[model samples]
Target: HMGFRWKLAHFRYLCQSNALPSHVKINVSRQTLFEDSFQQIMALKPYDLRRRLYVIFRGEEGLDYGGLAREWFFLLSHEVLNPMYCLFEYAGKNNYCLQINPASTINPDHLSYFCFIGRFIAMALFHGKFIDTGFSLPFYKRMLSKKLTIKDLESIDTEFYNSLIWIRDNNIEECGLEMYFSVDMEILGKVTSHDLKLGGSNILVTEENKDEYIGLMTEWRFSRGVQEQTKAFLDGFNEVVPLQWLQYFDEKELEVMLCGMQEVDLADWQRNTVYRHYTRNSKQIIWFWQFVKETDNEVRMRLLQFVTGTCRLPLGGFAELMGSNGPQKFCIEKVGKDTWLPRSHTCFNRLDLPPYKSYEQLKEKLLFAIEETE
Candidate 1:
């Protein structure tokens, strides 16, 4: 049943947020796709999976959102497969079978597009170990045989979402999704001391405060490799035209991006700066651009939570950059707790965001940091 494969090294690189090259930036063209999908995704209401599933298992918010962008664009291609799988499941109540390509498009006589998506799913499940969970693929297959309703599918989605939530909450380190978190208030406060839009006045973090923050930042980057690989795989395969089409990497470049990352030790000041920045910026950050990418969401949320909430309060006292602070105040009104958007049927899914002046700039800056090796 596992028809695909992802190189272990490739899967691991997606999580590395540190030891990336200092100068290299991710391909900028991906942002163009993100911009294109922005409006439609933000406008659509989420499927009612969570609500329906919540009734079955009280207080399970995560399970209700299956195949969301957070999960790897399962929703998009799965839509075509859902009805078919559902019908098949219904027809044979005890048996489950997924004909990777029923149309025989991949046979000697024909070469069809089915192989692209088929290869994509095969590789993902093969590497990620995301088998049907007994009820999952079978449930979808069954829906096809019976008179399926949106409500029925919605509940199924909830089960998917909850499974993910469970994985994340338990820190299932190798779960298909990945997370990164950090806090660096000193650096953050210094960088944006002049922005009037932010409420914080001139305040500077002390060396001690900075150390605490950087320590947190170091903790977060430890697993950058896994995250990067997953992202690259998703970006390459999920889209009609892959982002890897724009990827530029020579041996030296890849080596530089991977060097010092495997066991690098971060300084306290760096941690503090990153932590402060992340905490302060979380309220307004957009977590992901790719569709149905659960790994990206975990990374964004974990980082944002530290920057905007816990790390800021302590650093709020140390902001010497603002210079006039009686008590440094930061606002969280602009950030969102959670939301979904379809962003693209291709790779760029939805972004969970409040608002920002330049999404492109943000992507460049952050991606440059994460992908760099030196």
Candidate 2:
């Protein structure tokens, strides 16, 4: 029998091996992506209508990625109360199971575990996790249709339900634990990797193009919206920094600094710890390290109010310096030997920007707004 404890041990092993690609490290205190989506769905209908509507809302016969996202969002999030993940006996072995509440406002006969599980497996791929269920979509759809009863679901190939995925720990100090929804495929023939893209597509899935799906998922992780924002910020900043400043560090340090800037909202202790371990602070100016701290509780946050936009520019500049280089861009200004004024408004040229006596108290509000941008 494959018990829960053994399964969890196996998962931990996979995590330690660096087999899964970690993204969007979630904090236990913060609302998770699934929670945000689930809350919106629940608010759309009356409390009494939820159970029945959930079963019937399989929009467009599984073609609706939006609708599928909403349902799985509800399913996995609500599993805390209903306990969708469970253990069950199939054939001669025991396997981990995803058992939804059988009772609902609608006739349970109309609900198909095959379809539900199929969508779930596909959604896992969309979310950048691969599920290794022994059976494929072709087997499920051909044998287990929407008309199957719960008993029918259990009887079909109990062994096929055995599947697993690895989950890793977040290295961020304060945010200790990470959670994943445990949930299947070929329903890939009807849905391609493009269908799993952020906005989604209607492309057909096929074996010849199956390997392309994995490549699609890899690209999705490497170029998340947060990564794009980081690129834009760095590219704009690099436009002003001296070539020497950019080349002072070796390849690894440059990569570390780039990754660190994307995590500007990291907790104070966590950011500090990362700096001590990975950055070149004692060797060079450490622009990325200084920027994260300064933007958090230091001068950069206050100075951001005066820039052409309400954001900090990576290089030193003044709003007063605008339009001097044509229609205005940014002005690089040296304030001290190593320190320079991050771009600001011309109004700062006339009025001194006062420093906050208690930046820690203010950091919370500042970080909250920044998180919304992500």
Candidate 3:
């Protein structure tokens, strides 16, 4: 039988060991690339939706970078109740008999398990990123089939449902998770070796290649938008299209929704936790959601305003709001000094991974993630 406890143990091992890409480190303390954007995030209304973005965004990044803080929390959650990371294996295994060592983990049974879970994560990320980057033309086509319109943009529900179904059908039933792993590692590898230029492709977010960036951005934007649209659609329609539409929506909404299968609102703690990232504090999103469920709407709104910097960013005024929190914390604390926490452990470690002159080895590692996931 394939049980969660053992599966979790294996996952934890993957996270801590060399099995995970040594480059993945999510820093909650780091500010957004656009430091000034916090104001825009706060100004968003209905309060909860914006908070949803904040919580989901940071948590997803943390998970993507291999934070195990939420592992135990996920393991205990029931199957139907929790969509993202459902902790299930083949029905026959019952999730207890499975053993996962990457070298030996590639059995057809294990590969099927990974493809199932990996597709879930990829679809989630794709739709989530798709919406946040704005509903570009391609995204609109993927979501609506009809032309983009003001109504579609305004009707978050319509967009949500359309995206949800689109991602489920296209991402899972049709294309599958192998594509996600392939593209993800492919981009990572290309960027690392500086071979993005050499190939007729561009995946790294860089200044010189607007052409390549547009394509990459379009793909991610579509994935994310479809995810959000799918969410709004679920809430607005209350019509579950199929079991599959739940794929991407699982990760995007779980951080906010688990508190109430009813109210379906973003959890206060989830909102605040994500908000805290921008505020330079960190908290577990799931625990925060439980708190939000108990709190009143007014308090939730006020807190949202506070964390998102709407009511007052700097406390003193907006003049100081747009500015940074000063020197890069990673550099200031230990860098250039003898007592540093190791270069790769610094806040922006992913930045350092690609710069190594032993670049071919990095490419091989990324290719391995692609091939192994397949």
Candidate 4:
């Protein structure tokens, strides 16, 4: 079940966002072999189970999709795996059952390749505790057995627009077919910010407001490790924000937010930001603190929040950068009705630095500051 869900979630992510490789070339000869009684290729050997599966790309040099297939194969290979003991036990209990092959081939036009990959993904996820094998097996069977359509694929992700057209335009078979494509990192970054429930829809930031949105988006992506511009962004986004949190944001808002983010210095921000999480009543406040400043009167610092994509001002408190002293040592005093403030008001104050300023200044100030005694 864990395996099945990961594949489904990951697959849906690939389908909806242009986050995977789009230039997938299918081998004409291999396509023929794959379509001709595809069941044989999907068969797994129960008696002698292989620990790792490899996708074999075959054909004449120029037109072969072997490279693309190999790339996807190795990528998935790293993510999903077949545990030796589990497969051995299952084979013995189920009499070899529907053991998926540890090796496979693919053609450009058919969805069989993704389906082939999905099996291993399912297995890896199941064994890794993402899903239960019993539930995943039945689910996998149903997905494979169904006659897939463009509408069906579209329902999972709207980014399937071109793939749907490509399949339709090429007159590719509709049933059980998965479309091929790639990820548009800009699109995905924005889409994800919204999905994570970072508020403010359709808010386009120009040169004037770039500091505000760019800073937020930059730190958010960095803390999540998707700050780098690569396929890894897709994986990173999904990692930080679970699949359940996806598909809720308005598309236009996400687009606008992404547009603003393009101007950010993601690489620089990633290097400086230190991610910290504080949880209260099941709600988490993700903080990105880069630098600490101190004066005779107070200490000032500003932090970013992941969920709201906003900068939180320093709510005056006694915050120890390296909290070896712990919370009990930091004093808190009641100022109003149920309202409390840190007794050491000079310890933590709000720094009025924007995103870019914070990045630039991180080098100047020491992260942890100790006051001098007179």
Considering every candidate listed, which one attains the maximal TM-score? Answer: 3
The best-first sequence of candidates by lDDT reads 2, 4, 3, 1
lDDT of 4 by residue, 119-227 (tens): 4333332222131122112112122332233322222223443343443435435433331121112423355434222334445434344334433433233223212
- Give all candidates' CA lDDT scores: 0.27, 0.28, 0.27, 0.27
- Work out the TM-score per prediction: 0.18, 0.18, 0.21, 0.19
Cα displacement (Å) at residue 353, model 4: 12
Question: Evaluated with lDDT, which candidate comes out highest?
Answer: 2
The better candidate by lDDT, 1 or 2, is: 2
The alpha-carbon lDDT assigned to residue 324 of candidate 1 equals: 17
Residue 74 lDDT in model 2?
47
Q: Model 1 scores what on Cα lDDT? A: 0.27
Model 4, position 217: C-alpha lDDT score: 36
Please provide the root mean square deviation of candidate 3 (C-alpha atoms, Å): 24.8
Model 2 agreement with the true structure over 215-271: per-residue lDDT tens digits: 343333322222333233233222222223323232212222221212223343223
What are the runs in model 2 whose C-alpha is more than 4 Å off? 1-211, 215-267, 270-272, 275-285, 296-374
**Where does candidate 2 have its weakest 10-residue lDDT segment?**
161-170
The candidates, ranked best first by TM-score, are 3, 4, 2, 1
